Amino acid sequence: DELYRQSLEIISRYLREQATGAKDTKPMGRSGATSRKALETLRRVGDGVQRNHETAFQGMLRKLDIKNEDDVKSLSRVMIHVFSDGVTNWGRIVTLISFGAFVAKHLKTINQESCIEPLAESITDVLVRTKRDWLVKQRGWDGFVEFFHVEDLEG
Ligand SMILES: CC[C@@H]1CC/C=C/[C@H](O)[C@@H]2CC[C@H]2CN2C[C@@]3(CCCc4cc(Cl)ccc43)COc3ccc(cc32)C(=O)NS1(=O)=O
């Protein structure tokens, strides 16, 4: 399942980067060039999303009250409720992943880094297992990269 594998790698790397502040230097798996560009795009766009929605993100994090592995496990149900049961577009997919990064950073602050990879797996499961049809139709991660591509300015 290439789409799942690729999704997991991109989402897992971004959440880990966000939490630890360091880039993972290991090579990507299959489709490395696209996964690299997708991660680069997520960085650029996701970092802005977390700031543009700072108040809402903080509000939701407080409401969720995440303390441990049990709370983190409970998040899949909330993601299905809020993300899956709605219109699909790349903006909403970015909010899904960007809030995940926000949560991962919170997990590092409370010294619960071990829950970050499980969280990335949960997000990937929700995204891929509930929106595969849309993802395929939108050209998957190549489409994500194409959608957010910005041309260089003249001069
Ligand atoms: C119209 C702009 C929308 C962005 C602004 C939305 C803000 C919301 O008030 C909440 C702040 C976080 C947003 C809710 N979720 C996050 C979500 C549900 C809560 C648990 C959770 C846990 C993880 Cl680890 C990851 C995500 C979540 C589900 O993901 C999404 C996805 C899309 C939106 C909101 C959430 C959304 O409304 N996006 S928007 O339309 O771009």
Side-chain angles (χ1 to χ4, degrees):
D1 186 347
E2 183 56 66
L3 175 63
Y4 186 89
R5 184 209 65 71
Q6 182 175 35
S7 301
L8 182 57
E9 196 160 43
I10 290 161
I11 291 168
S12 174
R13 289 202 185 215
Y14 183 56
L15 263 57
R16 280 191 267 105
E17 226 169 61
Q18 285 277 303
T20 72
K23 184 177 304 189
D24 187 345
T25 163
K26 67 205 352 186
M28 298 281 197
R30 216 133 294 106
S31 310
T34 291
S35 298
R36 284 194 293 279
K37 292 181 172 171
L39 179 55
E40 289 162 8
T41 295
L42 256 184
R43 275 181 200 139
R44 173 169 53 86
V45 182
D47 297 9
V49 166
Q50 295 184 60
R51 294 278 73 198
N52 280 323
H53 301 297
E54 169 193 67
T55 305
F57 274 29
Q58 290 174 348
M60 180 61 72
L61 184 62
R62 178 159 184 278
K63 185 178 183 178
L64 293 168
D65 194 34
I66 305 160
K67 290 163 294 193
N68 57 49
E69 68 166 7
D70 275 341
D71 297 327
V72 173
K73 283 187 183 184
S74 70
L75 295 174
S76 302
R77 178 178 189 203
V78 190
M79 295 187 272
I80 294 288
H81 190 113
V82 173
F83 168 76
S84 301
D85 192 12
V87 294
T88 311
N89 55 53
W90 283 121
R92 293 196 84 243
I93 288 166
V94 173
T95 296
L96 171 74
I97 294 164
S98 297
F99 190 71
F102 196 83
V103 172
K105 283 187 283 188
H106 167 74
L107 288 171
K108 177 90 189 198
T109 74
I110 69 179
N111 334 288
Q112 299 286 293
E113 283 166 58
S114 65
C115 289
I116 292 178
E117 174 64 75
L119 175 67
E121 179 172 35
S122 293
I123 292 165
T124 302
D125 287 337
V126 172
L127 175 60
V128 181
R129 311 210 185 267
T130 75
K131 305 300 179 184
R132 185 180 305 269
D133 186 66
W134 189 93
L135 289 162
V136 168
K137 283 171 185 175
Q138 294 309 318
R139 287 177 43 83
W141 291 104
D142 285 307
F144 173 80
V145 171
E146 292 162 348
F147 185 78
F148 286 105
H149 172 75
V150 178
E151 278 288 5
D152 303 310
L153 292 167
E154 304 177 21

